[PDB]
Structures are given as C-alpha cells and as structure tokens.
Amino acid sequence: PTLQRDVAIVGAGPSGLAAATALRKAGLSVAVIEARDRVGGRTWTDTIDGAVLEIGGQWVSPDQTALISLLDELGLKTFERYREGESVYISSAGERTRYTGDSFPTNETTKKEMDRLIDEMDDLAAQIGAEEPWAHPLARDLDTVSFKQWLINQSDDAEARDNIGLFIAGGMLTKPAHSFSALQAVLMAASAGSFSHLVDEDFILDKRVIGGMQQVSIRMAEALGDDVFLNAPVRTVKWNESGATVLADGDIRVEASRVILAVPPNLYSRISYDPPLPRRQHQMHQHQSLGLVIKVHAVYETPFWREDGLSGTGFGASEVVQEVYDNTNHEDDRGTLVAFVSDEKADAMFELSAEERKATILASLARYLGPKAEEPVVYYESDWGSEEWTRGAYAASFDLGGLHRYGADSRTPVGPIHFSCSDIAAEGYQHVDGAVRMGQRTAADIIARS
Amino acid sequence: PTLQRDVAIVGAGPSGLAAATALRKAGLSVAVIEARDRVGGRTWTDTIDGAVLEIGGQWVSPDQTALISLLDELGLKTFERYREGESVYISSAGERTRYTGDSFPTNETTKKEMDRLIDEMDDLAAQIGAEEPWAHPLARDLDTVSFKQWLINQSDDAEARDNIGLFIAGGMLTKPAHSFSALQAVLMAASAGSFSHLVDEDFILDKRVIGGMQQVSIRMAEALGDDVFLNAPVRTVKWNESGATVLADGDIRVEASRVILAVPPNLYSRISYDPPLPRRQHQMHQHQSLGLVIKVHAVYETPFWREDGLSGTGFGASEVVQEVYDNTNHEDDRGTLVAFVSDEKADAMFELSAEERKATILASLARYLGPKAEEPVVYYESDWGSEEWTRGAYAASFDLGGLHRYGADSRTPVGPIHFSCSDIAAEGYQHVDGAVRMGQRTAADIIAR
Ligand SMILES: Cc1cc2nc3c(=O)[nH]c(=O)nc-3n(C[C@H](O)[C@H](O)[C@H](O)COP(=O)(O)OP(=O)(O)OC[C@H]3O[C@@H](n4cnc5c(N)ncnc54)[C@H](O)[C@@H]3O)c2cc1C
Ligand SMILES: Cc1cc2nc3c(=O)[nH]c(=O)nc-3n(C[C@H](O)[C@H](O)[C@H](O)COP(=O)(O)OP(=O)(O)OC[C@H]3O[C@@H](n4cnc5c(N)ncnc54)[C@H](O)[C@@H]3O)c2cc1C
C-alpha cells in the first residue's frame, strides 16, 4: 500500500510511539513502521517455560518524570522492587558481607575514597549537565581521558575505583571503563539527576510497571490502530528538502513531509538513503555502539532469600555476576531474581556452552544468596546481541572521544529527517524515560515548524 | 539474472578482485558484485578540471611484496616520488626550518626523546607482530591505554610526542591519539615492517604506479569480463551451512557455495543477512570505524618548489596541514602537491565554507613551500566521507579496547561467509597491499577448504 502522512516514523519502540502520540495530539497524521512482529523494541514482556518475564527495559526511577507522566496518561500503575532486609557485598578480596545502609561494608579508607569519588562526580554532573556536556570548558579534557584512567588519576584505592566503575561501566554503559571517557560517565550521572542516584539502587531501580514496561508501547500502539505497520522493516528513505518517501517490506510506501528515525544509532545504516546522508552523519554514526549485558532471570518456588532475611540485592565488582536483585513479579508467590553480566564478562560467558554458562552464572548467584539459588524452576538469559533489530543492551554510546567530537550533532535533523531514541537523549539517556523525552522533543520540533 | 558460482564476491576493490583472481586460477567460478559504476573502491583515478589525480590509495612501499608481485603479474610498472633537495619542518613553536637527513631539525633533547620513542615502538612491533597482536602477554595492558596516554607515560616532551603522533594518528589511523590504543599503534607499525618504516616517507611513500593505482583493480576486473557486475549494490545474503544466495539491485541473484564480503567492516550492516549474523559479529562490527583525512591536491604550472631547492616534503604536527609531498604525475611537466588534513582538523575544515577551507589549507601549504602555493591552477579535496560506499579514509580500526576484545574474530568466517579487506589485514593493514594479501588469504582458505 501507499499512504500520505505528515510524519513517517521508523520504529515502534517507546521513542517512536511517544513521538507518534504527541504528533497525533497536535493533529498531524502519522504512520509508524516497525520491523518486528510486535511493538516495544528494547522493552518486551514474554512467557518463558510458563514464567512471565520482562526481557528488556523495566525500571522507573523518581527522576523519570516524563515516563511517570505517560504511565498516568495510559492508566498504568507502578509497584516497588522488594528491598526489606540485608544486601550482600562481595569485596575485591572475595569476602562476602551482609549489610544495610547506603554504603558498602568496606574498610574506612575505601569508604572515604568512594565517598570522595561520588562527590566529585556529583559536582561534575551538576556543572556540566546532560543537555550539552560537550559545550562545557572542561569537556575536552574529560572526553579525551578514559573513565578508567580518570579514576586512576583521582584515587590510589583499587577497590574504590572498581566499585565506582561497577555503577557506570557494568551498571549503565555496559562497556568496560577503559573504552569510554570520563565525560561520558559525567553525562550518564547528569542524565539520572546525579551520580548518587546511580549508586542507590532504591532510586534508579525503584519501581516497575504493573503489567510490565512493554504495556507503555502496547497501549500507545493500540490507540494508533491501523497507522502501525508490523513485520515491515524499513529499507529505503528517499528524501529532499520538502519531504521523504519511506519504503518497507510488504510493498509499503509512505509519502510524508518529515521522517523520524526512531531506532538506535548503530542501526541507521541498515537503511539506504537516497541521496546519501551528509558526510557528518556518515562519520558520526560509525562512532556509536551498543554495550553488552546479559540480563539473567531465575525463577524459584518462593522468594527463598527473603526467608533468610536478605533483600535479594547483591553487589560484587569482581564477580562474573556483578549485580543481583529481587525481581519478583507483582502479586507473584514464586520468587524471581534478576542479575547482570556486563561487557567483557558477557563475552566470556557467551564463549562457554549454554550448560556451562548457566552453571557459572548460577554459582555466582549461589555465592550471593546461598545454594538454593542453584535450583531455579525456570532459567533464562535475555540475548539482545542476537536480535538483528537491536544488537546489544542496554543502549548506545560514543567510542572514546566521540561525545565531544560529535555530540552537538547527534540530534540535528538532516532536511526532513529527524532522529529520536533513548541513546541520544539528555535526561533519561539510555532509559525508557529518555526514549519518551526524545519522542516528545522531536514531535514538538516538528509541530513548531509545520 | 540468476547465476550459479562457486564464490560470490561482494565488492570490486583490490581485495575482492585479488580474491576472484586467485580463485579463477584454481578453477573455481566467481561473480564479483559491485555497488559503484566502477571498480577500485578506495583506489580511484579521476580527472578534475582537466587534471589527472589519484583520489584514493596510491603509494607502494618496499615492504608491500604482495602488491609488488601483483603489479608485475599485471604488467604494471612503478616510479618514485620526487625527493631531491630539502624538506621543511614546522616546529610546535611555529619555527620553519629547511633540512635534509633522517631526523627533524629539533633540538637534541627532543631528537633523543623521539629516537627513544621510535626504538620502543620498533621493539614492541617486533615482539607483538601484525598477525595476532591480541595474543601477546603485553596486549591487554597496551590495548586498554590510549596511544596519547601511553606517549605521556613514555615521555615528558610534547613536541616529541606530537611528532610521533603525526606518523601514526594523523599519518595512518586518521583518528586522534586519545581515541585508539597503544596496541593499535603497535599493530600499525608491525603491519608496515617497523615503526621506523612509518617515520621514513622515502620508505612508506616510496613509489606510485605508472598509470595510477586504480589500474591494479581495472586490469584484474578486465580479465574477469562478464563475471563483474557494476551498478549492483548487494542488499541481501541468504545463507545456510552449505551455501549462500546473494541478491543485488538490478534483479541480480547469485547462488554460490561461499560468499566473500570484500567491503570495509563499517559497511557490513548495509546488507541484510537471512538468518542474522551471530551476536559476535553483531557486536564486533559496531566497534569498527573508518578514520577521516582530507587528501588535498594542488596543481601548478610547474613544480615551483623544486626551483627553490625543496623536495615538496613538509611536516608540522601543529599545522592544519600536517604533511605535504611532491605528488607530480609521471612525465607531467605540471607540478602537483599532495597534502593531508587529519581527523579533528578535517572536521574543523569541513565546518568552514569550501572557500574558507581552501584558503585556510592553501595558507598552510604556503607556510611550508612559499607564497606560490596559494596560486594553484587546479585545487581538489578527496571527500571519501561523503561516499556512501566508503564513508571515511583511509581505513577502519577498532575503537579503544576493541582490538584485544574482538581482533581474534575479525577474520573468522560465518558458515559460508568470509571477510576480506585491508581493514582486517595483518601485514599491509589499511593499505592496498593488505587488501591484496587478504583477498589471496581468503581465496587460499576457500580453495583448500
Ligand atoms: C536488557 C535490557 C534492560 C533494560 N533496562 C532498563 C531499565 O530497566 N529501565 C529503563 O528505563 N530502560 C532500560 N533499558 C533500555 C530501554 O529499554 C531503552 O532505552 C528503550 O527501549 C529505548 O527505546 P527506543 O524507542 O529509543 O529504541 P527501541 O526500544 O530499541 O525501539 C527501536 C525500534 O526500532 C525498530 N527498528 C529498528 N530498525 C528498523 C527498521 N529499519 N525498520 C523498522 N523498524 C526498525 C526495532 O525493531 C525497535 O522496535 C533496558 C534495555 C534492555 C535491552
Ligand atoms: C584518500 C585515500 C588515500 C589512501 N592512501 C593509501 C596509500 O597511498 N597506499 C595504499 O596502499 N593505500 C592507501 N589507502 C587505503 C587503500 O586505498 C585501501 O586500503 C584499499 O583500497 C582497500 O581495498 P578493499 O578492497 O579492502 O576495500 P575497498 O577499496 O574500499 O573496496 C570495497 C568495494 O566494495 C564496494 N561495496 C561496499 N558495499 C557494497 C555492497 N553492499 N555491495 C556491492 N559493493 C559494495 C565498494 O563500492 C568498493 O568498491 C588510501 C585510501 C584513501 C581513501
């Protein structure tokens, strides 16, 4: 079919859908063209071996006002992650300690080092901000040093550096600390409101959506009805100064005034542009890549850890699994754990057979929470790297030096072509909130000019 | 049309064509499917405002024995870049000095610092090598430190650091030194036989091909006749364990036992794979990017600099143009300069209007060679970044940390799908020689099976 619309939107993840929703409200017509047999993108609720799991994005923090607002608008409610009882910390020396409170049970020297690093990052994030970190006078120096090297420059305490790395490298960017810059760490902190917010799992991992995060996209897509096209990978965008023609599998042709590419930036070159994008985009797009993390799901007859006075929370910068949390579904009697294996550790796990990887990861969960962790009734690994329409997790970031070199241009339209994803967002960077904010920002931009 | 072949080759640059040539010799049938209206890829001879120029790859060094061998095979001859007279060095302080000999005319302290850095890089390249740099016990530490930070760790002398950087960062990888690792610098040096080879422009920029480097591809393609398809972007590769179907514009369908993707790695995801490539490739391919350099051409009525006793060679790490050389065509009476503006300096130039960029570049050429440099009869910038079938120059390299993380897998076939380009080569890495070696290495792999 061929259709005429004010705006053609490539991708029905939260960003593309939030944009379509905002455009429709202003009276513009849209078509949303989506590669997969479903909406939601990097958010996805699925049933594996009889257990319902959130395969992708799921958490809502208090700072995420755009997503919170949208949840309310869509009639969706939240619930909080279980956090009663003691957390587990595993030190660099391999000592496991149960604790409560807002600091790891390390010695006083390491605690003071970590406190000072957290304060310095808070200071930098407050000064530099998330909107245009590249514009700050400090940006060049921060962007040309790796976060690893910056931490070495700030502190001689290895355990403090590794823990501070846990929160940004493994915890957020899902790339090793030698591979992204200090400026990118500052961006990540600023985007969540402060570095302190990223340190506190009760903030950044505060809540989930009743019915699952994928319902945000599902409900937006439902309102759009026949303007959403599924199983329709976009192959070609033909464009000039006054419009664009979007071509997708299934003989879909959308003639529009503007186009939104609502896909992560590592996938821009999946599409042929006629004429080609300018050299700026050709070059900039190559310097964006997704991280890698394995989101591990383990389902048990009960949340057994709670019976032992544990919250289900565990941290260990030197473990294959560096974070574990209670991820029990709302009103579920069965317990579910969620755990993360990041970057180079994820590579190492994928080198093993499935059997051996599962055994290794469950051994790591057993180290945190005890031998019952090794007996799940359902076990699943989210494998976003294998998905051709994603290719990693959680989200994209520049290579080292790329943020200051290209950052100013990452949201700039090319003629009628706009870009919208969490991966180029300011506040909410890399998160559903960022996707929503970018969708809304892009819609407002298009509305104002039309 | 639909055809059956032993091997379908995506891309008619030197790598794809070298592979096809080798395969035919062993009696395997091929089709070479090429996006552009021409062969040669990043090698390209073109005429701009009536002047013949080499828009892309052009130089042959003595270490490049695979290319030299191929040249002989194709009946192509070489000539040497003009190098008589004095070179020009511009110091960090902006001092311009004419000189001869194999070291910059800096003070003795800076000269010693540079010598020590060159020796250390030579040592590292000899130990680590170009074949599998990631496998060496020193590799992990070298790959997790930027070349900039490594230079800071080795020497306090900024002028020495910046000059060493000129040879690797601006001069080869065409990325800033803060963005790639020490191991990547070591790889680049090893790939050319030593760091010392990269320092000496009489080695790495020794010779050009009579008739132009593109003739290497043109002659290989001519021998293949109707098995080369032009104006045929490959869109889809459908595959299983025993074969592949390659689909290209113009209703081209090639059914083959094996496929060679003979394209730079930043372009692998231009093609849809059915089924998708494994997660290893999905991830690794995102961490590969081309550098950026503006290859500047300036044509004059004569090689005026020679009249002033200058070779045309100039170096200045703090100039917008950090290198300039005599690039006069073989038997041409007109003089042609070649100059290079790299990475972030290239970005800064492209921010200016064409008029202002030209004026800025030529003012830099005039600093090296005098006011006559500002009056070329023809002026041209190679703009590989704009080319959708290249998207930068010279070649691709991993982001920081990528070489040790993914290097071992950069040549690994996926079922029937092989990978061949200069950007994943060992010896001759990023150069025509590397493209040729990889094409031949890939062919031998398939032939032996
Ligand atoms: C394992 C995992 C855990 C996460 N955890 C958190 C967390 O808990 N909290 C949170 O806030 N977020 C988290 N994230 C990140 C969050 O899910 C993403 O930031 C968000 O989904 C990004 O939305 P988007 O619309 O910007 O991109 P996407 O969700 O990726 O949507 C892009 C869409 O484009 C489609 N597409 C791509 N190319 C084409 C094409 N050529 N033609 C047509 N369609 C195309 C894709 O199929 C996809 O549907 C998580 C993500 C993952 C993977
Ligand atoms: C300005 C510049 C100066 C250079 N200087 C030197 C130097 O002097 N000496 C030297 O040795 N080399 C130098 N190089 C590098 C050298 O040119 C390259 O290393 C070499 O050409 C790489 O060959 P290749 O076959 O590996 O890739 P390419 O030459 O890039 O060939 C790849 C081919 O694949 C085609 N293609 C891409 N995608 C598709 C698709 N989907 N379907 C069909 N076809 C496709 C492209 O059009 C291209 O023709 C230079 C390069 C540039 C750009």
- Do B290 and A282 form a contact (C-beta atoms < 8 A)? no
Confirm or reject contact between B287 and chain A (CB < 8 A): yes
* Of A443, A440, A435, A423, nearest in space to A60 by CA: A435
Distance CA A53, CA A38 (A): 16
- Do A326 and A281 form a contact (C-beta atoms < 8 A)? no
Separation of B13 CA from ligand 2 center, angstroms? Answer: 6
Cβ–ligand 2 distance for B43 under 6 Å, the answer: yes
Structure tokens at B53: 């120029």
Distance CA A323, CA A304 (A): 18
Q: Are residues B307 and B390 in the same domain?
A: yes
Distance CA B399, CA A173 (A): 15
Distance CA A429, CA A131 (A): 10
* Of A94, A25, A9, A145, nearest in space to A317 by CA: A94
CATH of the domain at A373: 3.90.660.10
Phi, psi of A232 (to 5 degrees): -135, 70
Distance CA A212, CA B3 (A): 50
Q: Are residues A235 and A118 in the same domain?
A: no
Distance CA A184, CA A134 (A): 10
Which amino acid is present at A279?
A: R
* Of B285, B147, B189, B174, nearest in space to A178 by CA: B147
- Do B12 and B41 form a contact (C-beta atoms < 8 A)? yes
| Structure method | X-ray
Structure tokens at A309: 């006075």
Q: Are residues A102 and A205 in the same domain?
A: yes
Residues 6+ apart with CB under 8 A from A80: A206, A207, A208
Collapsing DSSP to helix, strand or coil, B388 comes out as: coil
Confirm or reject contact between A449 and chain B (CB < 8 A): no
**Domain edge (last residue) among A378, A395, A412:** A395
- Do B43 and B213 form a contact (C-beta atoms < 8 A)? yes
- Do B391 and B266 form a contact (C-beta atoms < 8 A)? yes
Residues 6+ apart with CB under 8 A from A58: A43, A208, A209, A212, A213
The helix, strand and coil proportions of chain B, stated in percent and rounded to the nearest 5, come to 40, 25, 35
Q: Is B266 in Cβ contact with A286 (below 8 Å)?
A: yes
Separation of B312 CA from ligand 2 center, angstroms? Answer: 27
Which ligand is closest to the CA of B229, given by its number? 2
Q: Are residues B204 and B303 in the same domain?
A: yes
Q: Which residues of B touch A401 (CB under 8 A)?
A: 176, 178-179
Distance CA B178, CA A114 (A): 27
DSSP strand pairing (A51-54 vs A45-48) = antiparallel
Collapsing DSSP to helix, strand or coil, B332 comes out as: coil
* Of B2, B1, B16, B27, nearest in space to B259 by CA: B16
- Do A135 and A186 form a contact (C-beta atoms < 8 A)? no
- Cα–Cα separations (whole angstroms), residue B350 to A120, A241, A283, B347: 36, 21, 12, 5
Distance CA B395, CA B174 (A): 8
**Domain edge (last residue) among B175, B199, B223:** B199
**Domain edge (last residue) among B199, B221, B253:** B199
Q: Which of A65, A422, A429, A437 to mutate to test the pocket of ligand 1 (most atoms within 8 A of CB)?
A: A422
- Count of domains for chain A: 3
Distance CA B108, CA B250 (A): 63
CATH of the domain at B173: 1.10.405.10
Q: Which residues of A touch B280 (CB under 8 A)?
A: 350
Q: Are residues A170 and A194 in the same domain?
A: yes
- Beta strand extents in B12-85 (DSSP E only): 30-33, 45-48, 51-54, 59-60, 78-80
Which ligand is closest to the CA of B264, given by its number? 2
Q: Are residues A316 and A426 in the same domain?
A: no
Residue of B286, B288, B347, B412 for testing the chain A interface, max A β-carbons within 10 Å: B286
Q: Which chain A residue's Cα is nearest to B177?
A: A144
Q: Are residues A356 and A226 in the same domain?
A: no
Q: Are residues A115 and A229 in the same domain?
A: no
Task: Tell me the DSSP string of A377-415.
Answer: SEEEEE-GGG-TTT-SSS-EEEPTTHHHHHGGGTT--BT
Using the atom order of ligand 1, give the atom closest to the CA of residue A233. Answer: 42
To the nearest 10°, report the CA torsion of B440, B441, B447, B449: -170
Distance CA A200, CA A103 (A): 9
- Domain interval for residue B360: 42-61+78-106+200-209+291-395
Using the atom order of ligand 1, give the atom closest to the CA of residue A435. Answer: 26
Instruction: Give the resolution in Å.
Output: 2.0
Confirm or reject contact between A374 and chain B (CB < 8 A): no
List, in sequence order, the alpha helices (H) in A64-207: 65-74, 108-128, 139-143, 147-154, 158-165, 182-191, 195-199, 201-204
Q: Are residues B205 and B310 in the same domain?
A: yes
* Of A273, A266, A271, nearest in space to A248 by CA: A271
Confirm or reject contact between B388 and chain A (CB < 8 A): yes
Q: Are residues B273 and B304 in the same domain?
A: no
Residue of A282, A345, A389, A404 for testing the chain B interface, max B β-carbons within 10 Å: A282
Minimum-distance CB partner of B385 among A282, A290, A400: A282
Q: DSSP secondary-structure letter at A168?
A: I
Q: Are residues B204 and B301 in the same domain?
A: yes
What angle is formed at CA B118 by the lines to CA B185 and CA B83, rounded to 5 degrees?
95
Ligand 1, atom 50: closest residue by C-alpha: A57
Confirm or reject contact between A178 and chain B (CB < 8 A): yes
CATH of the domain at A232: 3.50.50.60
Chain centre distance of CA B240: 33
Residue reference for tokens 């072949």: B5
Q: Are residues B205 and B312 in the same domain?
A: yes
| A121 beta partners | none
Q: Which chain B residue's Cα is nearest to A344?
A: B405
